[PDB]
RNA sequence: GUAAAUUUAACUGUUAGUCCAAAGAGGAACAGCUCUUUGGACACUAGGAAAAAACCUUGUAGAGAGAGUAAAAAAUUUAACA
RNA sequence: CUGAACUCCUCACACCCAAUUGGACCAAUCUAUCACCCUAUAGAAGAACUAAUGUUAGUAUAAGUAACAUGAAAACAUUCUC
RNA sequence: CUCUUACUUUUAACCAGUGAAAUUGACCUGCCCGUGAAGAGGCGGGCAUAACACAGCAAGACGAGAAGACCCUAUGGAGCUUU
RNA sequence: CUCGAUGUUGGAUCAGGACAUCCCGAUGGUGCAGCCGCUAUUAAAGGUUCGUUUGUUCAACGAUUAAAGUCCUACGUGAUCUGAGUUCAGACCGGAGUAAUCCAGGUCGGUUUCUAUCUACUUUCAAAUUCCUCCCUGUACGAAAGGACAAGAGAAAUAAGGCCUACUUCACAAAGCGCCUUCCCCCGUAAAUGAUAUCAUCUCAACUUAGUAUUAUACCCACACCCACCCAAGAACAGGGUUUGU
């Protein structure tokens, strides 16, 4: 039974899980886009979002600095978190990352995901786009919308 | 081996089938199988069960006649048994003698 | 329930066999033939 | 065994014997070696028996072919198209006579299991039995427990 | 031949519009049923001995303690009636059973996730689809017109009810957890045998009897708790406070019915029949109904004098 | 009219129908009387089932059997009936069903004493 | 516990060819509009994703040349500028990674 | 009434036995027990006694979509009294 | 009345017992002489395999089962975790 | 131990790659009572019964493994002791 | 029957069945006043304890209990466990033997394999038993001593099925040491009216009453949105939710 168990069991145990997730997060901060097994990316995504919130507290908050020191194994990335990544999201309250499934890995057919910090300088991912508003179905619904709005104003 | 021994069962099963079919036809006329077969013999009618079963299926009017004949001979038997010898032999009870 | 000890038709305790009406008639039928044989062997 | 082989119903070729009898054997092809020992009995059959057998059956064309062969054979063909090949290897003259006569008398139909030892196209003269054959009719054909004129 | 879902082909602009449109229709349909007695109700017969009325479908909110005036603590389970409406009536003749039945449904769900046959059924009824539908055996005098809303005040404090729900699903479980088998000793030599069934049958029969207790799927089946006392009714939020615990997890749907226990037979003489009509009610009920023995939150502290 | 079958002797009390659910303790034995009140067609159905040949055709034959406890027969079944079979047992008449002609025809066999309190 | 008898091919074919064992047909395969290669509805197109990765790898190699060592991450934002382009007003104060190729059409300048 | 028998010549295999009826012995007037005797059956066919080596019917060999038979089915129901 | 491989019926007949014993045929092979799309009369012999936990080789069953393996990201440079 | 519970790792199950072993007369391989070389999935009488996977279990297949090591037999061995 | 192997004591685990009933139910008799007993008929739904020594089955003893039942199931159950005992190879004591060795003796030590092919089975879904306290009552009974039954009220234990408010182990949850719910019968006899047999007679006489359940009711019940995501659902599959598909 695993009712309400929100964390996955990966690596060699609880400590190894954190270390595995930490290495993924460190890579993400440096490169701003990485690919890894889908389950591991999904697990790390929560930590990648919260790291930005700690970065927004500022480099003068000693608690934030300790959190960043632990989670970023390469110390040149700690200035980037506080001075590059966190200012970029100054006007957002969340949704700093986007996660998309990519084709299964060749060797072991593992389910794979790409994760990136929004607003990076890298070539954009081929994001899934919704159907145009000009399609047959969307035009029939636009007519229905127009009609309802006209009947309400009357 | 089964094919060899089955030749006995084939003959046995065929005769069982004829008796079942003759029994059915006899009951349609209110006669039990032993009454029909027994009394037909007493009329010197030597039709075997294979032919009797065929007649029941394909010659139903002849079979009713045979059933009627057996029924008549059966009633003649009763009349004779009830009598003390005063009565002459039944018309259908007379046996044709050969020499 | 209702087992016969050992084999059915041998030994101390056996399955009881009963004489049917037709078994009796069969025996009597052959007794009559032998009785007549006695007669024809008397002369 | 019966289950392991085909079967057929008793039949004839063109209702043979109904208006007239027609011999079904149509052709006989013998192959008798001049020198083979196995063909010794076949050579003696060709010297005294085949000619007298042809006189009796003028509707059968007999083809005697003398050629080198290790196994002499007779091939019988029938009007219905059946072809039968029977070996006469090392058979006596009397044995061959019996075989040849048997082929003359056969219809040519397959020598397989016959389901019934009889055949008829008119099994019934008085009407084939059906469930109403011996049932009495009822006034106005009323069914059991049926209210009339309600 | 490829599968589709409701917003697969919708554009960015149309997805919010469609959500708002269908949401408003659901709310309007629910509001249109709030006056059952003004919409040609069926005959409201008086209660008679031997009469069986409809029950409710409620969601299990959780558990809460309450104390009685004698000082005793009783835990209760809160059951909230969420969009409960009568759906179908089947006559005794057509039921195929000894009694007529009334179908009740609870809790609104999305129309985009239901089968077409179900959607057309709800279209004719004029209600949004319900998550769970349950069948209540009733007497002819207790029939209610399909579409009538049902409320928590259908039940009253002091009544006893039975609650049926699916138990918590524990998946595949061993005999120890599933059946309470003792298992085997921890030490003193045991070889790879601590939680195992042991012997499952005798040697003679050379088989395993049907019904033999073995490892397998545990829970996630319907169970019924009988004779639970209704301590309190919150009419504003439509919550029923029921004694003790009920089967299932919090936020599951439960079937609430009058208790069938011999001792509680023919206690509906004073209960709403065929149901509670708040619109018909002459005097609005207070926000909370309390059983006489319950300590109300604002009552003075207990003193034993 | 399978509800109105009649057993000879004391078969109502003595004849037992045995079944087993398959579970431990599942052996069940009920008298003919108990079964009849539980299922008014069971007795006739079981009697027929046991007489049919013990082969795979039996259950097909049972599909052609239509048992009804009373005198109500569905209209469809009633419409397809062809012939009614004679009842195998002649039902004996009760003393109240005899006509006065029949009663008068049977002689009085003995003369009771005039001074006897019958 | 050993097999008490050999399993027949008739039995084995029933087990092996049971519908549960068979491969299920996929109904979520669709054509990619950008490139025309097949893709799954919920998965990014492999062809398009590979193209993006190839350009990303080239840019990352250029970033490495500018960094010229480990632990040299910049403290400012970065902008990739292709041949024939100059920094905009919004690109001032950002490390400029120059690519010796024409800007890809799918890659939109911002 | 029947057709075998002895002798001469030349050999092999069998020499670890079961039940049934009958006369007995041992045992416990136990054993599907053990030991002799007389006979049968089995270790060969087929039918019957529910299934069935040993009980009953029956043997000599093939084909038949004829026929007459053999053995062959379990019966029973109860306590008033001067 | 049913009911056998008993008996009769049409036709045919060497054609239902272990060990053992007598007899009639015979596959293929080689040789002599024939034969010459595969045979004949004889003479010979490593002369016939549904069974030895047989020998060798092939391929199944168990079974696609038991079991086995590669720390992480990345520009493949490098760095990080242990 | 009363009396067990929770969590981690391994194993496990699913996907991908690779891929053994004992075992196997043939099997279209149910249950009850009875029978029988004396303890029946296969016989008699009943009952039950569309077809086919996956995961568990160990009551039966007198389950697999080893031509019983106990016991007896063989004019079969061997070691040791000895008037 | 089995020696080309049917694993051999007691225990653990799980129990299936018989009734010749240990306890609980219903009755007859009594040298049955009552309270306790004795004996017989009926009843197998439910129940039938924990410890010290001993490998023990038993037995003895301590403390309990409504009661600590008798048996069968390959002396049930080792492809589920255990190995103290018994029953190899080491050794000691007593005894036997010239010795090698031996003993229905005692004593210390001594390897318990198996990946499940087939059969069978894996939620017989839901009516429960019992003790005690109070009361009846110091009443019926009896010379006294002693001392009930039925009815009623409550409170518990066990069993079954659930649950997490608190407590506890714990901490998005799973658990017990915690909490909640739990509903019919059962036939042995005792009596009327009344014939054979004009009294009488409870009747394998016709019949009436105690005296019975068509076990009641409950639960379950609508189903080409379904690629994908989430889940109190879950090995896989399946199931619920997405009006929560940036
Ligand atoms: K015996
Ligand atoms: K017999
Ligand atoms: K715990
Ligand atoms: K097993
Ligand atoms: K042995
Ligand atoms: K099997
Ligand atoms: K009397
Ligand atoms: Mg892992
Ligand atoms: Mg015959
Ligand atoms: Mg026996
Ligand atoms: Mg669960
Ligand atoms: Mg334990
Ligand atoms: Mg071990
Ligand atoms: Mg262990
Ligand atoms: Mg001798
Ligand atoms: Mg003969
Ligand atoms: Mg002969
Ligand atoms: Mg030859
Ligand atoms: Mg040889
Ligand atoms: Mg060979
Ligand atoms: Mg071999
Ligand atoms: Mg396997
Ligand atoms: Mg594995
Ligand atoms: Mg490993
Ligand atoms: Mg496994
Ligand atoms: Mg695999
Ligand atoms: Mg073997
Ligand atoms: Mg048996
Ligand atoms: Mg077997
Ligand atoms: Mg074995
Ligand atoms: Mg041996
Ligand atoms: Mg020697
Ligand atoms: Mg063996
Ligand atoms: Mg038990
Ligand atoms: Mg008793
Ligand atoms: Mg044992
Ligand atoms: Mg073991
Ligand atoms: Mg075992
Ligand atoms: Mg030991
Ligand atoms: Mg010594
Ligand atoms: Mg010892
Ligand atoms: Mg030691
Ligand atoms: Mg196992
Ligand atoms: Mg009292
Ligand atoms: Mg009286
Ligand atoms: Mg009187
Ligand atoms: Zn593409």
Curated annotation (Swiss-Prot), chain A:
Q: What is this protein called?
A: Large ribosomal subunit protein bL17m
Q: How does it assemble?
A: Component of the mitochondrial large ribosomal subunit (mt-LSU). Mature mammalian 55S mitochondrial ribosomes consist of a small (28S) and a large (39S) subunit. The 28S small subunit contains a 12S ribosomal RNA (12S mt-rRNA) and 30 different proteins. The 39S large subunit contains a 16S rRNA (16S mt-rRNA), a copy of mitochondrial valine transfer RNA (mt-tRNA(Val)), which plays an integral structural role, and 52 different proteins.
Gene Ontology CC annotation, any one:
mitochondrion
User: What are the recorded GO MF terms, alphabetically?
Assistant: protein domain specific binding; structural constituent of ribosome
NCBIfam families noted in UniProt? L17 (TIGR00059)
Gene name?
MRPL17
> Tissue-wise, where is it found?
Detected in adrenal gland, mammary gland and adipose tissue.
Instruction: List this protein's GO terms for biological process.
Output: mitochondrial translation
Q: Upper lineage ranks?
A: Eukaryota, Metazoa, Chordata, Craniata, Vertebrata
Per the record, the similarity remark reads: Belongs to the bacterial ribosomal protein bL17 family.
Query: Superkingdom of the source?
Result: Eukaryota
Q: Where in the cell is it found?
A: Mitochondrion
Q: Which Gene3D superfamilies match?
A: Ribosomal protein L17
**Which organism was this protein described from?**
Homo sapiens
Q: Which UniProt keywords apply?
A: Mitochondrion, Ribonucleoprotein, Ribosomal protein, Transit peptide
Curated annotation (Swiss-Prot), chain B:
GO cellular component terms attached to this protein's record: mitochondrial inner membrane; mitochondrial large ribosomal subunit; mitochondrial ribosome; mitochondrion
Primary localisation category:
mitochondrion
Q: Which GO terms describe its molecular function?
A: RNA binding; rRNA binding; structural constituent of ribosome
Q: Per UniProt, which keywords does this protein have?
A: Mitochondrion, Ribonucleoprotein, Ribosomal protein, Transit peptide
Its subcellular locations are: Mitochondrion
What is the top-level taxon of the source organism?
Answer: Eukaryota
Q: Which GO terms describe its biological process?
A: mitochondrial translation
Q: Which family does it belong to?
A: Belongs to the bacterial ribosomal protein bL20 family.
- Quaternary structure and interacting proteins, as annotated: Component of the mitochondrial large ribosomal subunit (mt-LSU). Mature mammalian 55S mitochondrial ribosomes consist of a small (28S) and a large (39S) subunit. The 28S small subunit contains a 12S ribosomal RNA (12S mt-rRNA) and 30 different proteins. The 39S large subunit contains a 16S rRNA (16S mt-rRNA), a copy of mitochondrial valine transfer RNA (mt-tRNA(Val)), which plays an integral structural role, and 52 different proteins. Interacts with OXA1L.
Q: What is this protein called?
A: Large ribosomal subunit protein bL20m
Q: What is the originating organism of this protein?
A: Homo sapiens
Lineage of origin: Eukaryota, Metazoa, Chordata, Craniata, Vertebrata
Name of encoding gene: MRPL20
UniProtKB/Swiss-Prot annotation, chain E:
Q: Which residues form a coiled coil?
A: none
A single Gene Ontology biological process assigned to it is: mitochondrial translation
An example Gene Ontology molecular-function term? structural constituent of ribosome
Where in or outside the cell?
Mitochondrion
Question: What InterPro entries does this protein's entry cite?
Answer: Ribosomal_uL3 (IPR000597), Ribosomal_uL3_bac/org-type (IPR019927), Ribosomal_uL3_CS (IPR019926), Transl_B-barrel_sf (IPR009000)
Q: Which UniProt keywords apply?
A: Disease variant, Mitochondrion, Primary mitochondrial disease, Ribonucleoprotein, Ribosomal protein, Transit peptide
The disorder on record is: Combined oxidative phosphorylation deficiency 9: A mitochondrial disease characterized by failure to thrive, poor feeding, hypertrophic cardiomyopathy, hepatomegaly, and psychomotor retardation. Death in infancy has been observed in some cases.
This protein is called Large ribosomal subunit protein uL3m
Give the species this sequence originates from.
Homo sapiens (Human)
Q: What is the lineage of its organism?
A: Eukaryota, Metazoa, Chordata, Craniata, Vertebrata
Query: Its gene?
Result: MRPL3
UniProtKB/Swiss-Prot annotation, chain G:
Task: Say yes or no: keyword Transit peptide present.
Answer: yes
Q: Which UniProt keywords apply?
A: Mitochondrion, Ribonucleoprotein, Ribosomal protein, Transit peptide
- GO cellular component annotations of the record: mitochondrial inner membrane; mitochondrial large ribosomal subunit; mitochondrial matrix; mitochondrial ribosome; mitochondrion
Task: Write out the annotated subcellular location.
Answer: Mitochondrion
What ranges does the record list as Basic and acidic residues composition bias? 91-103
Concerning PTM, the database record says: MRPL32 precursor is processed by the m-AAA protease (composed of AFG3L2 and SPG7), which cleaves the N-terminal transit peptide. Cleavage by the m-AAA protease takes place prior to assembly into the large subunit, an essential step for mitochondrial ribosome (mitoribosome) assembly. Proper processing by the m-AAA protease is dependent on the zinc-binding region within the tightly folded C-terminal domain of MRPL32: zinc-dependent folding halts degradation initiated from the N-terminus and triggers the release of mature MRPL32.
Gene Ontology BP term (one): translation
Name the residues that bind Zn(2+): 32, 35, 45, 48
One molecular function GO term is: structural constituent of ribosome
Q: Where is this region: Disordered?
A: 86-110
Q: Does the keyword GTP-binding apply?
A: no
* Similarity remark: Belongs to the bacterial ribosomal protein bL32 family.
The task this protein performs is described as: Component of the mitochondrial large ribosomal subunit (mt-LSU). The mitochondrial ribosome (mitoribosome) is a large ribonucleoprotein complex responsible for the synthesis of proteins inside mitochondria.
The molecule here is called Large ribosomal subunit protein bL32m
Species name: Homo sapiens
Q: What broad taxonomic lineage does this protein's source fall under?
A: Eukaryota, Metazoa, Chordata, Craniata, Vertebrata
Gene this protein is translated from:
MRPL32
């Amino acid at each position: 039974i695993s009712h309400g168990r929100v964390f996955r069991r990966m690596g060699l145990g609880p400590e190894s899980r954190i270390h595995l997730l930490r290495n993924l997060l460190t890579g993400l901060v440096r490169h701003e886009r990485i690919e890894a097994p889908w389950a591991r990316v999904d697990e790390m995504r929560g930590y990648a979002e919260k790291l930005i919130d700690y970065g927004k507290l500022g480099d003068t908050n000693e608690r934030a600095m300790r959190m960043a020191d632990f989670w970023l194994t390469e110390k040149d990335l700690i200035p980037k978190l506080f001075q590059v990544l966190a200012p970029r999201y100054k006007d957002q309250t969340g949704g700093y990352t986007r996660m998309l499934q990519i084709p299964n890995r060749s060797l072991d057919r593992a389910k794979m995901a790409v994760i990136e910090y929004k607003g990076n300088c890298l070539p954009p991912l081929p994001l899934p786009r919704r159907d145009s508003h000009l399609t047959l179905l969307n035009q029939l619904l636009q007519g229905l919308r127009q009609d309802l709005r006209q009947s309400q104003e009357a | 081996v089964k094919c060899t021994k089955a030749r006995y069962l084939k003959k046995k099963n065929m005769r069982t089938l004829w008796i079942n079919r003759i029994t059915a036809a006899s009951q349609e006329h209110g006669l039990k199988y032993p009454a029909l077969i027994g009394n037909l013999v007493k009329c010197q009618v030597e039709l075997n069960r294979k032919v009797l079963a065929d007649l029941a299926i394909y010659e139903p009017k002849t079979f009713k006649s045979l059933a009627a004949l057996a029924s008549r001979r059966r009633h003649e038997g009763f009349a004779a048994a009830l009598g003390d010898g005063k009565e002459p032999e039944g018309i259908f009870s007379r046996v044709v003698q050969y020499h | 329930r209702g087992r016969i000890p050992g084999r059915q038709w041998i030994g101390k305790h056996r399955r009881p066999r009963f004489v049917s009406l037709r078994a009796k008639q069969n025996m009597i039928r052959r007794l009559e033939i032998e009785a007549e044989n006695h007669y024809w062997l008397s002369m | 065994t019966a289950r392991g082989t085909p079967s057929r119903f008793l039949a004839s070729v063109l209702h043979n014997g109904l208006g007239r009898y027609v011999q079904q054997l149509q052709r006989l092809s013998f192959s008798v070696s001049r020198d083979g020992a196995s063909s010794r009995g076949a050579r003696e059959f060709v010297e005294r028996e085949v000619i007298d057998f042809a006189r009796r059956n003028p509707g059968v064309v007999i083809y005697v072919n003398s050629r080198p062969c290790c196994v002499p054979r007779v091939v019988a063909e029938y009007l219905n198209g059946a072809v039968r090949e029977e070996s006469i290897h090392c058979k006596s003259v009397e044995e061959i006579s019996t075989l040849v006569q048997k082929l003359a008398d056969q219809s040519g139909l397959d020598v397989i299991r016959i389901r019934k030892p009889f055949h008829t196209d008119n099994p019934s003269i008085q009407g084939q039995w059906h469930p109403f054959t011996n049932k009495p009719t009822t006034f106005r054909g009323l069914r059991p427990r049926e209210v009339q004129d309600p | 031949k490829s599968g589709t879902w409701w917003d697969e082909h919708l554009s960015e602009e149309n997805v919010p519009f469609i959500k708002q449109l269908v949401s408003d229709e659901d709310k309007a349909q629910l509001a249109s049923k709030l006056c059952p007695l003004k919409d040609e109700p069926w005959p409201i017969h008086p209660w008679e001995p031997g009469s069986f009325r409809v029950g409710l479908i409620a969601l299990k909110l959780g558990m809460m303690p309450l104390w009685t005036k004698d000082g005793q603590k009783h835990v209760v389970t809160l059951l909230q009636v969420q969009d409960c409406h009568v759906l179908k009536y089947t006559s005794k003749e057509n039921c195929n059973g000894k009694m007529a039945t009334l179908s009740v449904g609870g809790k609104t769900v999305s129309r985009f996730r239901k089968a077409t046959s179900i959607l057309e059924f709800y279209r004719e009824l004029g209600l949004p689809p319900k998550q769970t539908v349950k069948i209540f055996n009733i007497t002819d005098n207790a029939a209610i017109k399909p579409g009538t809303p049902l409320y928590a005040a259908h039940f009253r404090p002091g009544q006893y009810v039975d609650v049926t729900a699916k138990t918590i699903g524990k998946g595949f479980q061993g005999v120890m957890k599933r059946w309470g088998f003792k298992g085997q000793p921890a030490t003193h030599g045991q070889t790879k045998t601590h939680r195992r069934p042991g012997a499952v049958a005798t040697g003679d029969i050379g088989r395993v009897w049907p019904g033999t207790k073995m490892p397998g799927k545990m829970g996630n089946i319907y169970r019924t708790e009988y004779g639970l006392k209704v301590w309190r009714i919150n009419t504003k939020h439509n919550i029923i406070y029921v004694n003790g615990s009920v089967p299932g997890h919090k936020n599951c749907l439960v079937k609430v019915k009058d208790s069938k226990l011999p001792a509680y037979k023919d206690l509906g003489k004073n209960l709403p029949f065929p149901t509670y009509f708040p619109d018909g009610d002459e005097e609005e009920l207070p926000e909370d109904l309390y059983d006489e023995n319950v300590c109300q939150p604002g009552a003075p502290s207990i003193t034993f004098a | 009219n399978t509800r109105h079958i009649a057993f000879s002797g004391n078969k109502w009390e003595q004849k037992v129908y045995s079944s087993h659910t398959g579970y431990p303790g599942g052996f069940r034995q009920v008298t003919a009387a108990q079964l009849h009140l539980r299922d008014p067609v069971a007795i006739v159905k079981l009697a027929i089932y046991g007489m049919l040949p013990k082969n795979l055709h039996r259950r097909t034959m049972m599909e052609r059997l239509h048992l009804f406890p009373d005198e109500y027969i569905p209209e469809d079944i009633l419409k397809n009936l062809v012939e009614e079979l004679p009842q195998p047992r002649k039902i004996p008449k009760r003393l109240d069903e005899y006509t006065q002609e029949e009663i008068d025809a049977f002689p009085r066999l003995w003369t009771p004493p005039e001074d006897y309190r019958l | 516990a050993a097999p008490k008898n050999r399993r027949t091919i008739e039995v084995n074919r029933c087990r092996r060819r049971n519908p549960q064992k068979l491969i299920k047909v996929k109904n979520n395969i669709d054509v990619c509009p950008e490139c025309g290669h097949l893709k799954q509805k919920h998965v990014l197109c492999a062809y398009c994703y590979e193209k993006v990765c190839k350009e990303t790898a080239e840019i990352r190699r250029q970033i490495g040349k500018q960094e010229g060592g480990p632990f040299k991450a910049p403290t400012i934002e970065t902008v990739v500028l292709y041949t024939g382009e100059t920094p905009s007003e919004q690109d001032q104060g950002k490390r400029i990674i120059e690519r010796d190729r024409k800007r890809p059409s799918w890659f939109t300048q911002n």
